[PDB]
């Protein structure tokens, strides 16, 4: 409820962040220098041993320690708001769970990264006869995925098209809840994420020839459904049509790698606008996205040091 008592610990955690020189000096290391610098870092407090997998497990434990508590320590409308910040890992865990239930591998098959609800609920959801019964076992009150999967659950028993339509309805109900809050910037950031995901589905499905209206979603403000069909066709001018919006530098690109790189750049730049709101909740969302950019930078530098990457090989990864 209190968007300030959490904001104080948010400012404290914002005080615990690495500078750009911490990665700029990390452009030249040999994973032992990187291990020593991470040993200086707070994320190396869970530093178990040596090796890339130990480094990634320590990074996941540090992310759970510094980022997982934000889902806790709050109650009310602020809890309903801050729940829809670290939601991608939860939807990914639910998607892997649906894939495992439809596939047939072991319930300990996927590694089940940390999200919002109890992992014991995810273990208990491995055994459920009805999909609606599994949804009710996974039903939290303010979980948007619980309301999304139940509404999408009135089609069949367990289908992959049900899973894709459930992801579409998940993004749709996320946009509906983002419109259904008293937050001036969280709705804008969620809508920017929705339009970027629409562009990402368009670039991933460009040339597929499928139905774009079945692929296009609702909730954005930066593009059009006709612009969506133009992006579905081989027309980069629609990507050039993005002028004045946050999709500014996204122009003249056809390769999806640098396209989604600049998309993440625009998303992080919009997330940088969250420091303007010291009283609401978007500052905490900015802190979460900052830890996310730090996490991408950490696993990137970890891969670079473990495989000996060139500085030119990852030069397009720290430009913003």
């Amino acid at each position: 409820d209190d968007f300030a008592y959490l904001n104080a610990r948010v400012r404290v955690r914002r005080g615990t962040l690495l500078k750009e020189s911490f990665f700029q000096e990390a452009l030249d290391l040999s994973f032992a220098d990187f291990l020593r610098l991470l040993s200086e870092t707070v994320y190396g407090g869970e530093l178990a041993g040596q090796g890339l997998p130990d480094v990634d497990r320590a990074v996941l434990r540090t992310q759970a320690k510094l980022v997982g508590d934000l889902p806790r320590l709050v109650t009310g409308e602020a809890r309903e708001a801050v729940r829809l910040l670290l939601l991608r890992n939860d939807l990914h865990n639910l998607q892997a769970l649906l894939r495992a239930k439809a596939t047939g591998r072991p319930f300990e098959e996927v590694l089940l990264l940390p999200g919002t609800l109890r992992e014991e609920v995810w273990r208990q959801a491995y055994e459920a006869q009805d999909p609606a019964g599994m949804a009710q076992v996974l039903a939290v009150p303010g979980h948007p995925l619980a309301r999304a999967l139940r509404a999408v659950l009135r089609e069949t028993q367990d289908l992959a098209r049900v899973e894709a339509l459930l992801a579409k309805r998940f993004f749709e109900d996320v946009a509906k809840a983002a419109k259904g809050l008293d937050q001036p910037a969280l709705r804008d950031y969620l809508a920017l994420e929705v339009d970027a995901e629409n562009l990402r589905t368009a670039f991933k499905l460009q040339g597929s020839g499928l139905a774009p209206d079945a692929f296009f979603l609702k909730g954005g403000r930066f593009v059009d459904r006709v612009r969506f069909a133009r992006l579905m066709e081989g027309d980069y001018a629609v990507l050039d049509e993005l002028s004045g919006t946050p999709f500014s530098g996204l122009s003249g690109v056809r390769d999806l790698k640098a396209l989604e790189r600049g998309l993440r750049c625009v998303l992080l730049k919009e997330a940088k606008k969250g420091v303007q709101d010291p009283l609401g909740v978007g500052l905490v969302l900015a802190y979460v996205k900052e830890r996310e950019w730090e996490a991408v930078r950490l696993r990137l530098l970890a891969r670079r040091a473990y495989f000996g990457l060139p500085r030119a090989q990852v030069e397009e990864e720290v430009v913003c």
Binding site: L52, P53, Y306, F307, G308, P310
Partner: protein, 104 residues
Amino acid sequence: MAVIADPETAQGFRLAGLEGYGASSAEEAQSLLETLVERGGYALVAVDEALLPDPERAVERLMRGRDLPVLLPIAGLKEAFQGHDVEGYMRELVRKTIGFDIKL
């Protein structure tokens, strides 16, 4: 099919829909090689160069006949900054094959 290089390498192949294994030591690489040879896997096995250079040994000891799990000394990615020295591999191959190394 199947490959063995490294868990970080093998998870890309498992993402291809292709059976992966991964061993840090060369003896464990022949162990996993022996595993998929005894569990005769669809006839192809790729092996990284860094673990086994010429991995013919397990199949010539075990499956001397039938030529079936085809071996490949594939290149590893931390070494694929160099690019295997493909010409030197080919020289080594013809010298192994017909004995007589010459210049192409």
